Write a protein that binds this ligand. Structure first.
Ligand SMILES: [Mg+2]
Ligand SMILES: [Mg+2]
Ligand SMILES: [Mg+2]
Lengths: 48, 94, 49, 97, 157, 227, 227
DNA sequence: CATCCGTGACACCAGG
């Protein structure tokens, strides 16, 4: 089976920041740079 | 929150008596096909289906709204149990 | 249950020296350990999500 | 940014508002040009960011950058489970685990 | 917290003025900040409390919408019939509570307006709302606080 | 892959000429906010209304002065004038000056303004000021047509030397709240449901305001036609 | 004092890139117009994408082909980037046929041509065949809108066909700038510039027109109220 | 009235 990322799958970085994917927004809802490039992931600052 | 939960807690001397009353009333409604309801047709709880609004099938929502009307009497030693059973079977057949 | 597959990283006619990469294994990008993705993150709250 | 300055676009109005907010925050020096203050923010790792739902900017500059993120082995596809009724144990006649 | 905090600026730095039009003109020259504490004729105030005087919450928040002032600027607003020196954000928070509990007088009695909202003050708000209005209204208050806290934290920067 | 989209039912829920809820469901994923935000901006910035823009009160020099014989200061009077809901019956009229002269023991209301042709004061019961024995109030207020919100120190219009400029609260709309909730149509899962909430002052109604908003937006969409 | 219809400028670069300017617009209407158009451009612009692939002697996606360097997963990932423009408006499905052998880097050109069908990225790599490696593919391109994963459409024309994830949208990027501009004595006016990058299937101008039409059609939905 | 000794007890869910 080819498993895509879905709501409830667990991501983490190398510094101990772990978290479960709670929401997959469509591209047009994502915060984007002034030149129109949307961001991929939105991490909460309260985790730091 | 259950609509009017503060009032329901005001109606009883113990929060668990409210639960006993509501559950017994819900079983009474389930056994008699709701035919003994004290709610007028406009007070009936409704459920939105694909076609249109229908009667809420949740006997507990019904029992709590009935309690909220004031049209119900609750207490200990009101009537012998089988007397109540047979009178409700007469007034509302199954 | 994770897939362990190797993929060829060379092409026909290529000159290779001793110790040069020929096939990337699982979680390997051109011989570097590839355990994830490089994503573009913004660090901000988002409506409680 | 020099790319944009060459493609024929100046600094945006929302960028000006975010720069005003950043000046209030003590993040950029008051008096410099928009490009200078945007460069100061960028050196702090922060950029102007637009809310995709409204087009208005995030009131402050936001940290944005590339991060290495992995997908761990704990996927909900393997863990979601439910049961109405099912097999029971020999001696205890209780549900299996 | 972000919407209920007030700005404190250093430009004016406590200048003394006789007439408020002097302070307005000084701020217009660029010599005094909008939220810098000053003293006009003897009483401590700021330029923002004089330049902007709103007849009601709706006007203050309309001006906030049009970019005239920010939620963290100390301004003068007429709410509940009193002439309040407070930010539009604190007015907005008072209105959030009032709409949530559907009781304007009690909601005004519960809130501490002149303080930024944080863990302890919001906890005291939830407890007092409980005592005074019941768990159904307190649950609606909680969901309102959730909605607006998330909303304002998103765009706060 | 193949899609079918039922046209969404538009639902109105009003309470007088002051408030209304507007529900538009179902909408394809995302169009809730795509429709709500521009309409909100337009309803708050470009719906035509009226506003007090300048006030002259006899023997009053500046805005922060007190008035002998009246209990309120000039600031309070200017606030009450900001709350004046004036309606222009004639589409050609653009500006009026309203006269008000009273004295003695009396509480001036918005009724006491001398009537002017095709100027309907929607809220005549609006309190303005109270005077005492020996209190005199001679004032003229300036009412202009406009949109949005303009601070007093941005138009600064002065008919005479002591005409105090007033922050022009043009917009007939006082608040626009909107909220999108997820909704389903059968097994379509992420459809949107739009809910508008519009407060006005009575001069224009919420439904009228929303229709003017959608009209402005469509007319702006027409601007992509002639290179 | 009502501002009137603004000048609309169009700059283009091939079928790929486009800048669209509107000026002057009232304050805040730069965002009011630009953002919903951007959302609709990114979400609701119809287009084309590969939706199914059959390969001879290939039973499923997790396969290799002798003589072919790329596995089937990489071949489908490559085919996911195939831009296919339809010239006929009423065309819905095209079955591209590819047949190759020998030592060659099979690119997108090698697809046998079909009438009223153009491949916009012909240099797109497909496979790296060696001596004796044969590749015989039948790919299927459909018209569609938005993003539809293989698990939702499951399009198979023959038994051993592999459904493919389809990114139907032809819009690769949308930005918009709002700059300060003036008309006469009016200041704080908006100058809106939509920058649109597409794939070539549809041009930036066609996408802008379709998005404008979609937004106007959605504004139509407020026409029939209901208590 | 002490020391010595034998016998108890030592978090939950999950998968194992
Ligand atoms: Mg003022
Ligand atoms: Mg209080
Ligand atoms: Mg949705």
């Amino acid at each position: 089976q080819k498993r895509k990322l879905q709501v409830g799958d667990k991501l983490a970085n190398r510094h101990g920041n772990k978290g479960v994917v709670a929401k997959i927004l469509p591209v047009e809802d994502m915060p984007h740079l002034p030149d129109g490039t949307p961001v991929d992931v939105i991490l909460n600052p309260l985790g730091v | 929150a259950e609509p009017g939960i503060d009032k329901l807690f005001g109606m009883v001397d113990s929060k668990y008596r409210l639960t006993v009353v509501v559950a017994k009333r819900a079983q009474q409604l389930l056994r008699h096909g709701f035919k003994n309801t004290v709610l007028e047709p406009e007070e009936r709880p409704k459920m939105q289906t694909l076609e249109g609004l229908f009667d809420d099938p949740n006997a507990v929502t019904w029992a709590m709204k009935e309690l909220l009307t004031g049209r119900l009497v609750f207490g200990e030693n009101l009537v012998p149990e089988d007397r109540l059973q047979k009178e409700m079977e007469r007034l509302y057949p199954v | 249950g994770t897939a362990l597959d190797q993929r060829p990283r060379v092409v026909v006619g290529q000159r290779v020296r001793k110790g040069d990469l020929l096939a990337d294994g699982p979680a390997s990008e051109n011989g570097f350990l590839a355990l994830g993705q490089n994503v573009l993150v913004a660090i901000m709250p988002f409506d409680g999500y | 940014f020099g790319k944009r300055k060459g493609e024929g676009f100046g600094v945006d109005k929302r960028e000006v508002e975010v720069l005003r907010r950043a000046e209030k925050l003590g993040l950029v020096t008051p008096g410099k040009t928009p490009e200078e203050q945007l460069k100061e923010l960028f050196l702090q790792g922060k950029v102007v960011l637009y809310d995709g739902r409204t087009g208005e900017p995030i009131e402050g500059p936001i940290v944005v950058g590339q991060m290495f993120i992995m997908k761990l082995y704990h996927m909900v596809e393997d863990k979601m489970h439910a049961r109405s009724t099912g097999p029971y144990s020999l001696i205890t006649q209780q549900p299996l685990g | 917290y972000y919407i209920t905090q007030v700005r404190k600026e250093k430009k004016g730095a406590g200048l003394e003025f006789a007439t408020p039009e002097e302070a307005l003109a000084a701020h217009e020259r660029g010599e005094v900040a909008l939220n810098a504490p000053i003293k006009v004729a003897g009483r401590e105030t700021s330029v923002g409390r004089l330049k902007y005087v709103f007849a009601n919450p709706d006007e203050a928040l309309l001006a906030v919408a049009h970019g005239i002032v920010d939620l963290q600027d100390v301004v003068t607003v007429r709410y509940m019939g009193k002439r309040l020196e407070t930010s539009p954000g604190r007015i907005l928070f008072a209105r959030i509570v009032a709409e949530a509990v559907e009781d304007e007088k009690v909601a005004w009695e519960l809130i501490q307006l002149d303080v930024p909202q944080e863990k302890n003050s919001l906890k005291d708000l939830v407890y007092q709302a409980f005592l005074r209005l019941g768990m159904e209204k307190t649950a609606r208050l909680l969901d309102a606080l959730k909605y607006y806290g998330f909303t304002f934290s998103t765009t706060s920067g | 892959l193949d899609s079918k989209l039922k046209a969404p039912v538009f639902t109105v829920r009003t309470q007088g000429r002051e408030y209304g809820e507007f529900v538009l469901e179902p909408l394809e994923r995302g169009f809730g906010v795509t429709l709500g935000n521009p309409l909100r901006r337009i309803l708050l910035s470009s719906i035509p209304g009226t506003a007090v823009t300048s006030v002259y009160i006899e023997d009053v020099l500046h805005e922060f002065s007190t008035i002998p014989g009246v209990k309120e200061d000039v600031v309070e009077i200017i606030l009450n004038l900001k709350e004046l809901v004036v309606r222009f019956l004639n589409p050609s009229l653009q500006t009026v000056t309203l006269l008000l002269k009273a004295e003695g023991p009396k509480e001036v209301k918005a009724r006491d303004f001398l009537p002017v042709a095709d100027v309907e004061i929607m809220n005549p019961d609006l309190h303005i000021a109270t005077l005492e024995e020996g209190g005199r109030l001679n004032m003229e207020v300036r009412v202009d047509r406009g949109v949005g919100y303009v601070p007093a120190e941005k138009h600064g219009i002065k008919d005479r030397i002591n005409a105090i400029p007033v922050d022009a609260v043009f917009s007939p709309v006082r608040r626009v709240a909107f909220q999108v909730e997820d909704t389903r149509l059968g097994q379509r899962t992420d459809l949107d449901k739009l809910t508008l909430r519009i407060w006005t002052d009575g001069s224009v109604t919420p439904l009228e305001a929303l229709n003017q908003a959608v009209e402005i937006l469509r007319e702006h969409l027409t601007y992509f036609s002639n290179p």
